[PDB]
Amino acid sequence: QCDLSQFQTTSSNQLMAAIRQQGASCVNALFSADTGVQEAAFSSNHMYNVAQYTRTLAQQYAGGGSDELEALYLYLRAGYYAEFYNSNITFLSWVTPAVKGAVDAFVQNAHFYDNGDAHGKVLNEVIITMDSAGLQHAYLDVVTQWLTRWNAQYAEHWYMRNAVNGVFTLLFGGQWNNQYTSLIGEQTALVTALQAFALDRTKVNSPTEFMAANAARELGRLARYTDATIAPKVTEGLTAIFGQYPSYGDGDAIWLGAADTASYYADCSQFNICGFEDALRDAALNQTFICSDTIKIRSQDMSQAQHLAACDKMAYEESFFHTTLETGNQPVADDHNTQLQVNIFNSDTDYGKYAGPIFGIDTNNGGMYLEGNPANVGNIPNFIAYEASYANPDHFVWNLEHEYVHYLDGRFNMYGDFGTPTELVVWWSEGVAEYVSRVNDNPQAIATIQDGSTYTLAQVFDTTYDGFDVDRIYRWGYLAVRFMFERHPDEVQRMLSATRQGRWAEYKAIISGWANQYQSEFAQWTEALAKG
């Protein structure tokens, strides 16, 4: 029932009729519509007219929510999204002062701080627009007011928690706002409201703990302004947070939120939390399970049965790896990584909270393998993972087999440390980790052939991590590796002879010859695979 044709129009009045009749659910389609729709729907004139109408309707708002205003503000911030990401769209200079007028009218309405889920739905779009439109400098007092007014009754409503949590995005987005950064150093009331909000113990273990954690995080960010008049209050607030909550335990999301941003701009000794990561690693990964003399597990909260299933599957994968890769069990030169440490958090949330501090890693992924330096006697490589309900039984450790194969590949196939290759090896490393662990069980790899968008071997081999194209890296890396093992296993060993000796130019010439010689066969092979 959402027809985007109605937005492809030149009359402001029909546009708003489309907004009000089709509603927020259909306006939502403007974020992903073709540029033809977006250029028509998001002209400077349309945006000025919608903003002025929204302004008058918001002035008349009498509480209880508004499907029309929710849709209007969504359209307005949808426009800033399209203008940012569509080069065919650039707003004239009078567009934003009007959008600010439309926002101001909702903010100055006597019902702005109303409670309730219906009000939260329009309020959410208004608070997001403040960020989308680059208006963070204009609503600092709104942040302070919501932080000061928040209570348990606002906290009853899912849509109020979601809406008001947007005030923290405003502080985050203001970093790129020159007006904001000239003003923020004076906002002592906001700093006081932020620390009071995060130090409220009733938020711990509650549905608003995540807002208190975001409060702490945004306060830690203000540690940047070392010479600003807010700096004593910021320091005092961070010090209070670090003293009231544990780095592991109830409320540690608030502790770790503050530590994350504050450690980026202030020394640990400023808050006397130097070396907290050692104690945290021991609290968070408190279990020890010894699989063998070459694999040990440190984990947050696995059962003995899970520990046993992980050790057994890794012993199984090891054997299958060496047979399949024909290693002779002989590692590459200059590699002393006989022992491995496996680190398993209780959930992706736990991984997201603790692994960054403990291991220094990015956690926007499904796990991580850290080979270290194999030439250093005493180096212990680590992989870091989390339990997931959708992981493999019986261990339910997400990417257990995948990361383990990274260790095996790194020790038996790929000379040097992780950064050593001078030619791209992403397709191989990720493809062999997927193929050795999944073999022929990869529905998503079949599906990405069936959808009609494909890659050539040459494109697969030139895959990088840039933009983390999971489809290209993991599915098409898997497909090329599986194809070469099934159809040209002698060529695979020839390639491995180059990689095992760190002969990267020779490796690249080998696989570029494949990309010329085998492309038609690969094309027929993927076709047969997609058929059945």
Partner: peptide
């Protein structure tokens, strides 16, 4: 970049 859809 600006916030995406809800």
């Amino acid at each position: 970049g600006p916030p995406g859809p809800p």
